[PDB]
Amino acid sequence: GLMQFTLPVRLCKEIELFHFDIGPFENMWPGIFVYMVHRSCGTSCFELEKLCRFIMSVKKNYRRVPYHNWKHAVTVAHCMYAILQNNHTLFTDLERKGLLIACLCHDLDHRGFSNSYLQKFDHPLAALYSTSTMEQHHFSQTVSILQLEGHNIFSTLSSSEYEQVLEIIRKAIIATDLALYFGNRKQLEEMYQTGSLNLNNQSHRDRVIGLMMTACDLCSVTKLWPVTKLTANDIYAEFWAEGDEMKKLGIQPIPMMDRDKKDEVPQGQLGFYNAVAIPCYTTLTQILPPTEPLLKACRDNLSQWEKVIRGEE
Ligand SMILES: Cc1nc(C)c(CCc2nc(-c3ccccc3)cn2C)nc1C
Ligand SMILES: [Mg+2]
Ligand SMILES: [Zn+2]
């Protein structure tokens, strides 16, 4: 009960900043997460025995793929921690509990392949879940882990709080389907500008939580340049493996997934910052002003990709 987690001084300081990298020491990531729950939620939010046992079962059910791995899980949870800590009073006790778990579980049992590749391969998951295929699987895996003897970190919630938290987590995880981001941001953009945005409207909070999940999910673009650049290698290593597998099915992959077209990565990064990342953190900054540093970091990294094209690196 009186047992805190305490990080070394540099981590204790830097973990509070949006651009924090969780480092190459896998064995510290669970402690880093528990630290974030204790400071975000309280030392009372979960039983430490049950949380530790949930954390390690979640870790086990992430696979050894270049990008959609345990490191991604914890990185995306740290971004949500940063957003929550800079927006103290805007979020209920339940949302703070649900969203850090949502981020940890958001890519559970990812195989390194897009929804499109499951569909063209005719993977069983594509018959079971016709839209947001992997994302319904990720939530399904979250529910399974919560139901292992000793793993129900929500046991001490009422029947109705329990139903509310699983519903926060479900929507949170479904919203990490980037296919749903564009429509969600357009609606949030119209609501902010016409002045109709209302954070007491549950359907409005849902869209805002949705945008936060896209922001934490893309947070690789908001790091210091060297982290951003090295994480891009991992993102493309998966994409190019999927390109390879598309070709084995007799289908030319889109350029993004074709290793033959590596040359075009800088222009592809420009497109992505302009069409997806910058709009995302822009709308997020309007709704939640203290998240401006993510927009600032994203703009700095757009500038770094501009320099790559200009042959300056
Ligand atoms: C978080 C994240 N998510 C995505 C999806 C990407 C891919 C960025 C992209 N590259 C291309 C591209 C690349 C090479 C050749 C042709 C096209 C097209 N697009 C959209 N990058 C990051 C950092
Ligand atoms: Mg995902
Ligand atoms: Zn993800």
From Swiss-Prot:
Domain PDEase, residue spans: 1-312
Binding site residues for 3',5'-cyclic AMP: H68, Q269
Residues engaged in binding a divalent metal cation 2: D107
Binding site for 3',5'-cyclic GMP: H68, Q269
Superkingdom in the source lineage: Eukaryota
Domain notes: The tandem GAF domains bind cAMP, and regulate enzyme activity. The binding of cAMP stimulates enzyme activity. Composed of a C-terminal catalytic domain containing two divalent metal sites and an N-terminal regulatory domain which contains one cyclic nucleotide-binding region.
Record's disease association: Dyskinesia, limb and orofacial, infantile-onset: An autosomal recessive, early-onset hyperkinetic movement disorder characterized by axial hypotonia, dyskinesia of the limbs and trunk, orofacial dyskinesia, drooling, and dysarthria. The severity of the hyperkinesis is variable. Striatal degeneration, autosomal dominant 2: An autosomal dominant disorder characterized by striatal degeneration and dysfunction of basal ganglia, resulting in hyperkinesis.
Quaternary structure note: Homodimer.
Stated family: Belongs to the cyclic nucleotide phosphodiesterase family.
Protein name: cAMP and cAMP-inhibited cGMP 3',5'-cyclic phosphodiesterase 10A
Protein encoded by which gene: PDE10A
